[PDB]
């Protein structure tokens, strides 16, 4: 639609603007029950081929049941939290005696009933497989009437189709300990996930968003085990509970802005250590530094609120004036001057440094730009390949408008003979304070003689 | 059971105490063999529906066999090692000529026989699928008697059931190059894994531990390809070999203990860069900084000792006295003062900083705490939700006892105008040495005039 961007040459930072987002401000627990069956014995003294097939399938189902019984740069400056606390909470509140029979009694007639539970928390509890009502009288009475013989052959294939879900549950849970992400489609069928999304206490706008975009909801949930005994086998599929809706979440990319000097390796360098997402919520912004935890599906930006910092809104004025005395922008200091490129949402930021050959090549024309020294930006329209040194990046071909804010780099605002190049993480105010301290150092060393 | 915890307000660090653990001090290699079959030709000039089905299945099996033939903060300060050296070692010692013929000769009668091999290493080598004994005379004589026609119809479904294991082996290995993790259930059936754990040269206590907890053993092993030829397709599953048993592994969480000052962003702030697990083994402690590599299944702490450091026992006295001159505690220095919360095993550590509203809300009462400035701890009993700024963490609901020791933050023990805040990793002795050096500079610069 209107995914624009701006490129600021002050720090050679890209800001892609217009990315109406959806955070993950809450969790929501929902207790899937699979109605299991208990079999006393499957003796079958007689032997036929189809009876051998159904015996092997029942043995695999029993082994699955026994299995389930046995199955009971600004990244450091963040907040770490376990992401499965709600599911463990409802599992612990299930594990007390008496709640299982309440679940089974409340799910006898209705398919998608709601259980009040002992804790006062409402959990949606609903069967999805109902294997008990199948095994009840379809296979056990047949197995024990004609001296363990099946008249038809389609029954074992029907049992295969019904038992595939439970066997995949067994495999997917046993591979991933007890907590697995993402939730698979045989873990929760998509019609049932749509019905569960529609039936849980959320905004109708969030219903529209999370029914149009069930892929990210599926890719963001967490399914944890619960009680298995009393043939009730249950697991909690903790689902995301999205908070703010359609909020402009601008994305910030940065590339190393070094000096233009070529002599040896004596170069000063500011790299803005602030890359990631900035979503607007409440009176603040959520900052997501982990670009691997925020999904970019369509033009909506789903994210993980638990893996975010909070910042005041003045960080928006960080985008315009890097020396603005309202918010302290975070930059990092470095002396290495390697050529590096980061491809933004539409264009590409390049910094070709020392002696390297970079070009912006289009597959229908050839090289068109041939970047010189310094940070530079190449728009989406015109190019489809960016080569920096001997590495090739493909630039995103997503349509939109680009703006180029002209200016001079902040390298020219610093004095190289006194500039500090140790800080892995710092700020503009801290760097300027150290510059002032070292300038007073120079002046007091001058006046001491 | 008795998972206790302590909160130290000196560095606002949580230590959860009592986590009887299990390291991974060794590997153990085991040679799974799938008995393959060689088919000269499957011509079948006549055609039928079921014969077409069995022909497509045999073609899929042949393609799978051909593909198998073609298939032949303290994180930097660690020790990096390849995790699959034992499986590669036994694969290399198998690759020499004549070994797999010995495997077949020793595995003809017994289903779990042991071979001595040429290297002197004893490897448990055994069959799990025995497809050669099935294809021997169940399908090939039938295919070549009634002009390529099958009288029955369940034989192809039985062949599907038997070939599902080999086809899933092909898929799971071709997806993950040659080395996959975790080992899947169709890669090694759990009855076979329990019998293999029972038969391998380990403590009986460790047998009980890895039979009750086959989940994490399944989630820590590594399966590697081996020789494919001579219809004796083999692969080595390298199983963890747990060392110490039920040793206390106290967990250390830290949160940024920044200063209480509010003027601009001139804050002096200490973050203990020591988070992770602490197990006791031999006369030392093993330190796991990677909290993503240690599983916390039940109250047992399985870990990966290849990603651990060794420390003397005096690091335990790092917990009580941060200025103790027996072990040098590791701290990091920072000026940024964002609000951050980590959630310990039972409670939550919060630090609400600058102008940031945080609360500890219970779902049945509402907000109960409303943290002020400074580090603070909120127990499990009373809350189930911790909001810091605009982010919402769920706190673990695991039962246990909490202690809250009283004291003053160590930032108040430091001088604001002389503190060094550029150390990504440092120690108490190093920081105090730099403080002493800078104070000596201050006194010599005062005395120079």
């Amino acid at each position, epitope marked *: 639609q209107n995914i624009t961007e701006e490129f600021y040459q002050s720090t050679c930072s890209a800001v892609s603007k217009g990315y109406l987002s959806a955070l993950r401000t809450g969790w929501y627990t929902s207790v899937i029950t699979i109605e299991l069956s208990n079999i006393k014995e499957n003796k079958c003294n007689g032997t036929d081929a189809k009876v051998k097939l159904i015996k092997q399938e029942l043995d695999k189902y029993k082994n699955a049941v026994t299995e389930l019984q046995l199955l009971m740069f600004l990244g450091f400056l963040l907040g770490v939290g376990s992401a499965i606390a709600s599911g463990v909470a409802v599992c612990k509140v299930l594990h007390l005696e008496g709640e299982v029979n309440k679940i089974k009694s409340a799910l006898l007639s209705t398919n998608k009933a709601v259980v009040s539970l002992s804790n006062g928390v*409402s959990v949606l509890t609903f069967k999805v497989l109902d294997l008990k009502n199948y095994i009840d009288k379809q296979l056990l009475p047949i197995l024990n009437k004609q001296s363990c013989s099946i008249s038809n052959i389609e029954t074992v294939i029907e049992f295969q189709q019904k038992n595939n879900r439970l066997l995949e549950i067994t495999r997917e849970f046993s591979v991933n300990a007890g907590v697995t992400t993402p939730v698979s489609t045989y873990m929760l069928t998509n019609s049932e996930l749509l019905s569960l999304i529609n039936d849980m206490p*959320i905004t109708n706008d969030q219903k529209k968003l999370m029914s149009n975009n069930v892929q990210i909801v599926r890719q963001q949930s967490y399914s944890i085990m619960c009680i298995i005994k009393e043939e009730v086998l249950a697991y909690v599929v903790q689902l995301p509970l999205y*908070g703010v809706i359609d909020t402009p979440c601008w994305k910030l990319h940065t590339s190393p802005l070094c000096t233009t000097n070529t002599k040896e390796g004596s170069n000063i360098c500011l790299t803005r250590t602030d890359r990631g997402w900035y979503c607007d919520n409440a009176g603040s912004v959520s900052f997501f530094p982990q670009a691997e935890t925020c999904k970019v599906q369509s033009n909506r930006v789903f994210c993980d609120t638990m893996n975010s910092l909070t910042l005041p*809104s003045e960080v928006n004025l960080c985008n315009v004036d890097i020396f603005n005395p309202k918010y302290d922008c975070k930059i990092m200091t470095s002396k290495t001057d390697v050529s590096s490129s980061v491809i933004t949402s539409l264009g590409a930021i390049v910094s070709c440094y020392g002696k390297t050959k970079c070009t912006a090549s289009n597959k229908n024309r050839g090289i068109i730009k041939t970047f010189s020294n310094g940070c530079d930006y190449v728009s989406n329209k015109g190019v489809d390949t960016v080569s920096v040194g001997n590495t090739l990046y493909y630039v995103n071909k997503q349509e939109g408008k680009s703006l180029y804010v002209k200016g001079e780099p902040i390298i020219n605002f610093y004095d190289p003979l006194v500039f500090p190049s140790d800080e892995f993480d710092a700020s503009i105010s801290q760097v300027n304070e150290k510059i002032n301290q070292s300038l007073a150092f120079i002046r007091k060393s001058d006046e001491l003689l | 059971q008795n998972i206790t915890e302590e909160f130290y307000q000196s560095t606002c660090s949580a230590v959860s105490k009592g986590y009887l653990s299990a390291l991974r001090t060794g590997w153990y290699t085991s040679v799974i063999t799938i008995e393959l079959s060689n088919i000269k030709e499957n011509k079948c000039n006549g055609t039928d529906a079921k014969v077409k089905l069995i022909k497509q299945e045999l073609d899929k099996y042949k393609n799978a066999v051909t593909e198998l033939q073609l298939l032949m903060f303290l994180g930097f300060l660690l020790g990096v090692g390849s995790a699959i050296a034992s499986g590669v070692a036994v694969c290399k010692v198998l690759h020499l000529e004549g070994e797999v013929n010995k495997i077949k000769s020793a595995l003809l009668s017994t289903n779990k026989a042991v071979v001595s091999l040429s290297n002197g290493v004893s490897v448990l080598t055994f069959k799990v699928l025995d497809l050669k004994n099935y294809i021997d005379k169940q399908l090939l004589p039938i295919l070549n008697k009634q002009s390529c026609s099958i009288s029955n119809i369940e034989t192809v479904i039985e062949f599907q059931q038997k070939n599902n294991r080999l086809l899933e082996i092909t898929r799971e290995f071709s997806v993950n190059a040659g080395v996959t993790t975790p080992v899947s259930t169709y890669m090694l059936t759990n009855s076979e894994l329990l019998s293999l754990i029972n038969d391998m040269p380990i403590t009986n206590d460790q047998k009980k531990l890895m039979s009750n907890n086959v989940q994490i053993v399944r989630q820590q092993s590594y399966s590697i390809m081996c020789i494919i030829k001579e219809e004796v397709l083999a692969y080595v599953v390298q199983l963890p070999l747990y060392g110490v048993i039920d040793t206390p592994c106290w967990k250390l969480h830290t949160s940024p203990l920044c200063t209480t000052n509010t003027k601009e962003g001139s804050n002096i702030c200490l973050t203990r860069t020591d988070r992770g697990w602490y197990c006791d083994n031999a006369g030392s402690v093993s330190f796991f900084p990677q909290a993503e590599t240690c599983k916390v299944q039940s109250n047992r702490v399985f870990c990966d000792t290849m990603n651990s450091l060794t420390l003397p026992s005096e690091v335990n006295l790092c917990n009580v006295d941060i200025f103790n001159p027996k072990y040098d505690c590791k701290i990091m220095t920072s000026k940024t003062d964002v609000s951050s919360s980590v959630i310990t095993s039972l409670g939550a550590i919060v630090s609400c900083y600058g102008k940031t509203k945080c609360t500890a809300s219970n779902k049945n009462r509402g907000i109960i705490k409303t943290f002020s400035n400074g580090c603070d701890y909120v127990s499990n009993k009373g809350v189930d939700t911790v909001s810091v700024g605009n982010t919402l963490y769920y706190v673990n609901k695991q039962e246990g006892k909490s202690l809250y020791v009283k004291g003053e933050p160590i930032i108040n023990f430091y001088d604001p105008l002389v503190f060094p805040s550029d150390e990504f990793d440092a120690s108490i002795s190093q920081v105090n040495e730099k403080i002493n050096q800078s104070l000596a500079f201050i006194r010599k610069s005062d005395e120079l005039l």
Partner: antibody, heavy 121, light 110 residues
Framework: VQLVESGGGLVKPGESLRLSCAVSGSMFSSYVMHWVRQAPGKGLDWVSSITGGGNYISYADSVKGRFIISRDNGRNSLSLQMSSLRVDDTAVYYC???????????????WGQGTLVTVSS | QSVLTQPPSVSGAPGQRVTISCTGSSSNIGAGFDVHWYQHLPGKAPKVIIYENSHRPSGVPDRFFGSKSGTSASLSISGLQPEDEADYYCQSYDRGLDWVFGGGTKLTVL
């Protein structure tokens, strides 16, 4: 944070008009906004909603499709196109700016002054 | 006409506790949803006294105490004071008519 709007008066039934809201907030980009109404006699009701960018329009069941809600993010304003009119729509209308919930729901925070729209005769 | 039902004939003298109670259907309130209460003195705009059934905004005294249970919400006022005569409300999030509003209770002193 106070909301001020204008556009009221007497309007004959049937014809359309525009009712504008001139919120002077500082972060009118994330807050979920609504319009509510109240008539003398019967209780207060709900009219319309809008969430952020403007891709999640939601309406009441009493009036659907007839009212058009839009907002100018750059100019910091709301607007309702009042297409078609019946007798029941004579009411005092309130802009209402509310924050996102701990789950997703809005509790209708600080309200506007309230503009009277009369449609009788 | 609204799905929210409360009797709009509740009044009491200043001094004692008066409880306003409003109940909803199964689709609203009891299906895991929330109930918020607003106040409507004539003149100035309505403002929220209580949201999420427990919390309070910045300027709200200790007179107001709200609660919800099942499909019924209540709001108790302890020790009435004379200028509290207004229209107290309940709101909910019925999945049909989205942000449904109660009929309102006219609370007056005697």
């Amino acid at each position: 944070v106070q909301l001020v709007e204008s556009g009221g008066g007497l309007v004959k039934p049937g014809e359309s008009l525009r009712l504008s809201c001139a919120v002077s907030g500082s972060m009118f980009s994330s807050y979920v906004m609504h319009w509510v109404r109240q008539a003398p006699g019967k209780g207060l009701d709900w009219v319309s909603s809008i969430t952020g960018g403007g891709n999640y329009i939601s309406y009441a069941d009493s009036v659907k499709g007839r009212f058009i809600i839009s907002r100018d993010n750059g100019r910091n304003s709301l607007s309702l196109q009042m297409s078609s009119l019946r007798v029941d729509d004579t009411a005092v209308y309130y802009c209402v700016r509310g924050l996102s919930g701990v789950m997703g729901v809005t509790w209708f925070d600080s309200w506007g002054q309230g503009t009277l729209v009369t449609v009788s005769s | 006409q609204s799905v929210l039902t409360q009797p709009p004939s509740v009044s009491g003298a200043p001094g004692q506790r008066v409880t306003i109670s409003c109940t909803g259907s199964s689709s609203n309130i009891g299906a895991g949803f929330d109930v918020h209460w607003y106040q409507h003195l004539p003149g100035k705009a309505p403002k929220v006294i209580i949201y999420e059934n427990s919390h309070r905004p910045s300027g709200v005294p200790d007179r107001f105490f709200g609660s919800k249970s099942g499909t019924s919400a209540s709001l108790s006022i302890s020790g009435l004071q004379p200028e509290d005569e207004a229209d107290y409300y309940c709101q909910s999030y019925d999945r049909g008519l989205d942000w449904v509003f109660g009929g309102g209770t006219k609370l007056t002193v005697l």
